[PDB]
């Protein structure tokens, strides 16, 4: 798919993901949620080749849910991100690689810290204060490099995210039909229904 953004503020991680699903010359759906809850305090957004994206996300989801049940324990975001990276790093030298880029936003309940990980289809992991995949970063990183401060409040993070989406809506050629925004904090995961 197209645009997926992430921003880590003081006490939460905010993921924004486009709603459009274009298959050729037609916009098939304008309400697609490009994300899966891996665990109560870990969310993964994704974008790449059709089919592979969802197949990969649900495969990762299942594995983490299996781990949670076996150990009666939630893995740290760092641990989940490392598991995901290894799967993609394994995948890139396969017969047919997963063509999927992901952002993993999680709140570590042990350290009481939000964490944002950006991983591409090659298995290239980086922890960031804010991240993006595809052409999104080309427009948004300049704004983020400018207005972001690490002690921001979730509301300030959302305002800065609106600034990013407005710039994308102005300068990007493709109509991505707005974004679904989700916040990950100590209380878990919730969706901002008005954006």
């Amino acid at each position: 798919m197209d645009i997926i953004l992430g921003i880590r503020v003081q006490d939460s991680v905010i993921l924004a993901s486009s709603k459009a699903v274009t298959r050729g010359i037609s916009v098939l759906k304008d309400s697609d949620d490009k994300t899966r809850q891996l665990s109560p305090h870990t969310l993964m957004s994704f974008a790449g080749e059709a089919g592979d994206t969802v197949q990969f996300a649900e495969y990762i989801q299942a594995n983490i849910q299996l781990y949670s049940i076996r150990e009666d324990y939630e893995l740290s975001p760092q641990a989940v991100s490392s598991f995901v990276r290894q799967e993609l790093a394994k995948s890139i030298r396969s017969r047919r690689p997963y063509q999927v880029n992901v952002l993993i936003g999680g709140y570590d309940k042990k350290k009481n810290k939000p964490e944002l990980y950006q991983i591409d289809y090659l298995g290239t992991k980086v922890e960031l204060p804010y991240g993006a995949h595809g052409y999104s970063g080309f427009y948004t990183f300049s704004l983020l490099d400018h207005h972001y401060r690490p002690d921001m409040t979730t509301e300030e993070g959302l305002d800065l995210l609106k600034l990013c989406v407005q710039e994308l809506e102005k300068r990007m050629p493709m109509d991505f039909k707005g974004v679904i925004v989700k916040i990950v904090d100590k209380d878990g995961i919730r969706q901002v229904d008005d954006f």
Binding site: R93, Q118, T124, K125, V126, L128, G137
Partner: protein
């Protein structure tokens, strides 16, 4: 397209008097786009240091792999691996992927704990060992580093002088490369103390 120059980055190592130095930039990018300015390329397993340039997924993967192997080595041997031995391990590990290689340019640096002799070594992506006395270079600005090192370097430099030489070799080489820079780290290594210094450089 060329895997060795998608992410970009550089590493350089030098020998001094009873000391070695290894340095790297902090950039990680997706071609023209700068993504991270905290992607370190130097790792260590005990007192042996390993710098890795090239494709970032493989840099991360190999680090995890050599951590794996050096941890088992230590449990069985009941001692930390030495630079000379680790160098052979890196070569072996890389050549086993001869026809499906990791796209990297590793650089080993360290001091033998028994002999006290400084040691550096470089490799190609498939295991060929370049065991130089003076210096080793790797990355997208290796040509630049070769020119800087070949002119700036002199043998038997003291730790604090060696720092200046390797720092200026890296900095000025990175500034002539589009895919390198965005910060830099320098490790100064002595037989039983290691100092790590982050360098102030231009962020473009």
């Amino acid at each position: 397209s060329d895997p060795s120059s998608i992410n970009g980055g550089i590493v350089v190592a030098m020998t001094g008097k009873d000391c070695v130095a290894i340095a790297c930039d902090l950039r990680l990018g997706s071609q023209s786009l700068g993504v991270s300015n905290k992607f370190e390329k130097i790792f260590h397993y005990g007192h042996v240091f390993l710098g890795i340039t090239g494709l970032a997924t493989d840099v991360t993967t190999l680090n995890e792999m050599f951590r794996y192997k050096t941890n088992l080595y230590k449990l069985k041997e009941e001692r930390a691996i030495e630079p000379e031995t680790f160098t052979q391990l890196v070569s072996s590990s890389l050549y086993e992927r001869r026809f499906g290689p990791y796209f990297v340019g590793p650089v080993v640096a360290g001091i033998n704990s028994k002999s006290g002799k400084p040691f550096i070594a470089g490799f190609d992506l498939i295991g060929c060992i370049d065991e130089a006395k003076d210096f080793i270079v790797s990355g997208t600005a290796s040509d630049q580093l070769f020119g800087m090192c070949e002119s700036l370097y002199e043998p038997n430099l003291e730790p604090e002088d060696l720092f200046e030489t390797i720092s200026q070799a890296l900095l000025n080489a990175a500034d002539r490369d589009a895919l390198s820079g965005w910060g830099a780290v320098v490790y100064i290594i002595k037989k039983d103390e290691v100092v790590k210094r982050y360098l102030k450089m231009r962020q473009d």
